[PDB]
């Protein structure tokens, strides 16, 4: 399926990915930032 779907798209899709044209602008830093629930949140989450 993968190679067939690739070969169907190859004649009529362009997809470069950023580094091939954004040659000199760097990637995003992604920060997965965790939080606890607050006391009222912990209670209402438990009530659910």
């Amino acid at each position: 399926q993968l190679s067939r779907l690739h070969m169907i798209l190859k004649p009529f899709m362009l997809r470069r990915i950023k580094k091939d044209v954004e040659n000199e602008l760097s990637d995003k830093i992604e920060i997965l930032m965790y939080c606890q629930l607050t006391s009222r949140q912990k209670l209402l989450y438990q009530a659910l």
């Binding site: 830093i29 992604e30 920060i31 997965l32 930032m33 965790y34 606890q36």
Partner: protein, 447 residues
């Protein structure tokens, strides 16, 4: 990719009972060997199992129990287990026997304050209120002139209304220094104004001002709501005995003078009973008759024990839990009359006695373990066996109390966990009631 993780707030502090989470009974009412933080005491826990069903049944008034047994047998731990077992919705009122000795009010009435405080009440209070920005304010004079009517314009995110009010509300608005462009709240029940702030629409009007600017209110100018109030009969008694509600100069100044207690007269308690019976008939109220717990009951004065004959026989009274750690004492205020648990025999008939008894060494090992993992510490098995040995040599509390000093020594000399050499060192740094009473009797010439 990257992560961030934070939580700077300290925990609750570990207290001498905070491992107690419930009575640890099964659904048939039998005691589990150790559960919900408790260990052992099977008969005394199964007896408390009958009492927590007694409370939840609501049927009784003034039934009472005496947890009786040596120091360190867990009497206050079972009464705390009852407080956890009932949950927060039912009032458990903790009291100590020597708290009746007020200097503001009689001993024979401090007991009635606690008895009225242990009877909880849940009220479906409908409040009807006005809130908004004060867009207009005009008091009206009329002929004998005096101020007699008030016109107020209020505005919210849901448009605006003009309301017409009693001049006591204008005197309240004047007291709160309310002016046009303020945001206010007025419950029409109390007639109580709150100035919320100045409307945030005006926040640019000055370079420098003292005001809290606040966003314009939402929903209608005039609206009604039900508050599910939790309250106790004592809160009704005392609020009527020194009134701070309404908005006259008197209530406004009973809010300033020293808040002395007063010997509430039985006529007031009677009129409160009549009123709350009508809130119960109206379906506005649910009564939740709770528990009074008198720790150290053995030093209520004989005035108080003889009051409790009448108090425990009231058709109103809460269920009462007593604790005593004493043998055949002389009863306080009698000069020289002795009776079991330090309580007069005349009162001792009126209570179901729950005898509570000394632990085996195996129950001490098991409590010390459950306690150590609650104080948040790790302890090696030969060290805990040495604390169990100290339990046989001394008492449960001394054995438990070596845990946190041992953990302090463990982290100070760099370990993760308590080794036996830490407990064996701490045992020499800190004496106990039995071993101190040796050196203090040996050196008796010098104190």
């Amino acid at each position: 990719k990257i992560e961030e993780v934070k939580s700077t707030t300290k925990t609750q502090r570990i207290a001498s009972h905070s491992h107690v989470k419930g009575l640890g009974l099964d659904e048939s009412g039998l005691a589990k060997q150790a559960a919900s933080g408790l260990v052992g005491q099977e008969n005394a826990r199964e007896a408390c199992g009958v009492i927590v069903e007694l409370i939840k049944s609501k049927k009784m008034a003034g039934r009472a129990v005496l947890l009786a047994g040596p120091p360190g047998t867990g009497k206050t731990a079972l009464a705390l287990a009852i407080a956890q077992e009932l949950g927060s919705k039912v009032p458990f009122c903790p009291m100590v026997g020597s708290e009746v000795y007020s200097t503001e009010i009689k001993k024979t009435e401090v007991l009635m304050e606690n008895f009225r405080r242990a009877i909880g009440l849940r009220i479906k209070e409908t409040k009807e209120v006005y809130e908004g920005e004060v867009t207009e304010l005009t008091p009206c004079e009329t002929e004998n002139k005096t101020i007699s009517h008030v016109i107020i314009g209020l505005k919210t995110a849901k448009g605006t209304k003009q309301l017409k009010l009693d001049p006591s509300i204008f005197e309240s608005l004047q007291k709160e220094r309310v002016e046009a462009g303020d945001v206010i709240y007025i419950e029409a029940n109390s007639g109580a104004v709150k100035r919320q702030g100045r409307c945030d629409t005006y926040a640019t009007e000055f370079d420098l001002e003292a005001e809290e600017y606040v966003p314009l209110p939402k929903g209608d100018v005039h609206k009604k709501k039900e508050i599910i109030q939790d309250v106790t009969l004592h809160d009704l008694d005392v609020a009527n005995a020194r009134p701070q509600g309404g908005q006259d100069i008197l209530s406004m100044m009973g809010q300033l003078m020293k808040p002395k207690k007063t010997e509430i007269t039985d006529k007031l308690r009677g009129e409160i009973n009549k009123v709350v019976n009508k809130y119960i008939d109206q379906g506005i109220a649910e009564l939740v008759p709770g528990v009074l717990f008198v720790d150290e009951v053995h030093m209520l004065d004989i005035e108080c024990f003889t009051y409790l004959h009448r108090a425990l026989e009231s058709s109103i009274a809460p269920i009462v839990i007593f604790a005593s750690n004493r043998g055949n004492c002389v009863i306080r205020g009698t000069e020289d009359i002795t009776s079991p648990h330090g309580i007069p025999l005349d009162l001792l008939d009126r209570v179901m006695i729950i005898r509570t008894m000394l632990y085996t060494p195996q129950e001490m090992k098991q409590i010390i373990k459950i306690r150590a993992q609650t104080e948040g510490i790790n302890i090696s098995e030969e060290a805990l066996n040495h604390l169990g040995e100290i339990g046989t040599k001394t008492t449960l509390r001394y054995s438990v109390q070596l845990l946190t000093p041992a953990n302090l020594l463990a982290k100070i000399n760099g370990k993760d966990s308590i080794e036996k050499e830490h407990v064996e060192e701490i045992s020499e740094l800190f004496y106990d009631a039995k071993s101190s009473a040796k050196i203090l009797a040996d050196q008796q010439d010098k104190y």
